[PDB]
A paper describes a structure:
The spike (S) glycoprotein of [name]-[name]-2 mediates receptor recognition and viral entry into cells. It forms homotrimers protruding from the virus surface and, once engaged with the host-cell receptor–human [name], undergoes a substantial structural rearrangement to fuse the viral membrane with the host-cell membrane. The S protein is also the primary target of the humoral immune response during infection. A large number of [name]-[name]-2 neutralizing monoclonal antibodies bind S protein, especially its receptor-binding domain ([name]), providing a basis for vaccine development.
In particular, the Beta S protein contains the D614G substitution and additional nine mutations, including a cluster of mutations in the N-terminal domain (NTD), three substitutions (K417N, E484K, and N501Y) in the receptor-binding domain ([name]), and one substitution (A701V) near the furin cleavage site. We then used the focus-refined [name]-1-[name] structure to further analyze their interaction interface. Still, the N501Y mutation could compensate for this loss by generating a new hydrogen bond between Y501 and K353 on [name]. The N501Y substitution could also form more aromatic interactions with neighboring residues including Y505 from [name] and the Y41 of [name], in line with other reports. This could contribute to the higher [name]-binding affinity of the Beta S trimer relative to those of the WT and G614 S. The Beta S trimer structures from this study show that the E484K mutation changes the 2H2 binding footprint (epitope) property from acidic to basic.
Residue numbers in the entry:
A (entry chain A): 19 to 615
B (entry chain E): 333 to 526
Amino acid sequence: STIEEQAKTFLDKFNHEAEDLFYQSSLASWNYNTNITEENVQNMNNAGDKWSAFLKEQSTLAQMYPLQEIQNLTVKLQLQALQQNGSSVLSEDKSKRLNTILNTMSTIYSTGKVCNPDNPQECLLLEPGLNEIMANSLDYNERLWAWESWRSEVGKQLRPLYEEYVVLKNEMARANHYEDYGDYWRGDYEVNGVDGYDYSRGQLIEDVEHTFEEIKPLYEHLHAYVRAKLMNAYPSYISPIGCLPAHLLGDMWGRFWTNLYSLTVPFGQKPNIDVTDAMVDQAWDAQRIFKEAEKFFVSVGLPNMTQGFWENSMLTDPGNVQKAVCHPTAWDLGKGDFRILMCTKVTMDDFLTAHHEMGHIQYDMAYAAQPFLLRNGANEGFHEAVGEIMSLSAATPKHLKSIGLLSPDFQEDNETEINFLLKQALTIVGTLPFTYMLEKWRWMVFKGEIPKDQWMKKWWEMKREIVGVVEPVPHDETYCDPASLFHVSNDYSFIRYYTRTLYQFQFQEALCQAAKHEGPLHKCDISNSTEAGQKLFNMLRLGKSEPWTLALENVVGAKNMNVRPLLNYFEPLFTWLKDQNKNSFVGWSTDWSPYAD
Amino acid sequence: TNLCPFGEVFNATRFASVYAWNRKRISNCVADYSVLYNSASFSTFKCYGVSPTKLNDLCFTNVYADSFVIRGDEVRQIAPGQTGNIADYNYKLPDDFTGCVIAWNSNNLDSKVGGNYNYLYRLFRKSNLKPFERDISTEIYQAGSTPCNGVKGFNCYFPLQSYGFQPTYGVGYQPYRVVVLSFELLHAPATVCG
Ligand SMILES: *[C@@H]1O[C@H](CO)[C@@H](O)[C@H](O)[C@H]1NC(C)=O
Ligand SMILES: *[C@@H]1O[C@H](CO)[C@@H](O)[C@H](O)[C@H]1NC(C)=O
Ligand SMILES: *[C@@H]1O[C@H](CO)[C@@H](O)[C@H](O)[C@H]1NC(C)=O
Ligand SMILES: *[C@@H]1O[C@H](CO)[C@@H](O)[C@H](O)[C@H]1NC(C)=O
Ligand SMILES: *[C@@H]1O[C@H](CO)[C@@H](O)[C@H](O)[C@H]1NC(C)=O
Ligand SMILES: [Zn+2]
């Protein structure tokens, strides 16, 4: 006779309806990905529209149950995700305007290409074209040409569309009673209904700012080392006390520094660890790779693959007859269906990527017992992070010597430790300043603290100060640099990549300390230890049904996000970098630019 | 001098939905449980209050063969002293149940591409079901105090829901055809033995 009964009765009706319609759209998307035809596009569109109207229709009845009279927490957590009506609150006239602009900028990013003034008839796209030039070319002009031509051509189109993109998303938040649209993305970490675990939307800003301060000592030396290596290869084009040029960072936006490992490698005469030539002589295929990966999760106690997994998954390029996207993705279709779509080749990277894509499956099978609305990551940062901690143990020398890839007589010494960490240091640590900068930039724009004319001025002030990167050519108000990036134009919140970095090493130090590991952290392997696997399994099955601050307390014994595992992981490297940087200037000033002479 | 016709109970092409579950009386015949126990085609085969070896030589006067189709993970809810949707709202065995439980994998047949919407279940009901009670009523469930008048709407739900079956589900969900056998004794003579 209460609202609680009407709430449980409604959601129970909603659960078995969400199971059936979501599996239709997910299976249709599977058909589109594996088999690309004009006929398969309409099958995904019709299935994707029914699910879009279903959550839109159920949101009408959901707002009829007030959360004020609901005592039970689990029902309140489910409706809170369902009751939000999203973009439907906006007027119907601007409704068509928003989705069109979302699709307009998306096509500009996909169809965007660069064209040289020399032969206008020939042009090159970003992928593969610019990503091959930015990574593989050591030339100063060639890298600079690819850097400017992409932001100059594409930036002119997206900026006038991006300004209207800001206006529409702002009124949607105020209709949802949020201070700005940036508060909407920070609302995913919001916690209410549990005494003492409440994590406010504004607490995220103060925390992320505090966490990045302790990373600066590690990063200022890591940036000082990369600047020292590229200086010797480019004496005239790089100042010793100045910030790094943008196009020399290894890729277009400076997101991943992995491409710079070639020139920045600590020791050239020491052999790098490579499992590639070991897999060729053994002639492994996509079949045995996951068997070695599935055997890993058996050692930690986690459940194994379903019989329908190996039958329904496409593990290789389906020939030249039908084209398929080879971007690795872990597809959870619901109702006990778990699939991994990958084009598998024999490489060191694919074997390390294999454990990542399999990590999501072990993660989704844990909370699969929860109802659909509770089927999700505990937060937006755990779902991706769980796959990375598994790849960490897979790249360690101990796990590779156990499965037979690396020779048992392989020699290990001081020069080996630094080599493997600096490769991980460029990817893991190098992406933090870029990620914090991007999120702080969107948050001040949506809030309104930045006038529209100061965007390009405020952007490169954060480039120089936070990340220590300067523009090779000045940009006026016409260009929009961030819009050219994938996640900016595709309307994906990018903070996920900052949190998964901090949450992976917390799990890493927690699970290894539970395995009674001895010595350095980077040599840890969780294989054969059930103590860690069972401890981790406690959180994985919770889903979003519990506050992430509460679920995090189980694994790491700490309620707050902390970077202490991150510095402890690179502590062997952090000591070595300062020894090579004692003769070099640490730090950078924001008043230097390459175009000011 | 006749064998009990288990052939039409197990190998029937199409069974009833779990709320529609079909009862078939079996009497005046001789039942051979050995081929059933020795076939090894049955995923879950259990008995309660009787041993599968002992019932080979034994005589029960009434044998009821119940037939329905449920979810793979919902098989555990068929047993004495169990709760849940299938137990409370669909098919309910009493705590004293003396019979056996039989299940096997139907996924090679009952499931087809696109889902099969014939199989249904009752998701909501006003109260729990008494032992062995078939309720076929299609009457609209009433959650609230708002009169339904037999139309869909707010807090008025159509209780019968469908299980979509594609071949591609994981082993857990897959459809199973469950046959529940009941055994009782009354004043009637027992014509069913080994
Ligand atoms: C892919 O779709 C086309 C279009 O109907 C069809 O002819 C072809 O058989 C499909 N291939 C596979 C492997 O399903
Ligand atoms: C809330 O309801 C669910 C089932 O609807 C139940 O499992 C849970 O225990 C309830 N919460 C509390 C605090 O009892
Ligand atoms: C997973 O482990 C169980 C444990 O008994 C085993 O029966 C099953 O065959 C395993 N899965 C596969 C695909 O072999
Ligand atoms: C786990 O134990 C097995 C059994 O002795 C062993 O072969 C394997 O190498 C162990 N794992 C690691 C990573 O050493
Ligand atoms: C059903 O058919 C199979 C094979 O056709 C047979 O082995 C089985 O005994 C039959 N069922 C019964 C109850 O005899
Ligand atoms: Zn991932």
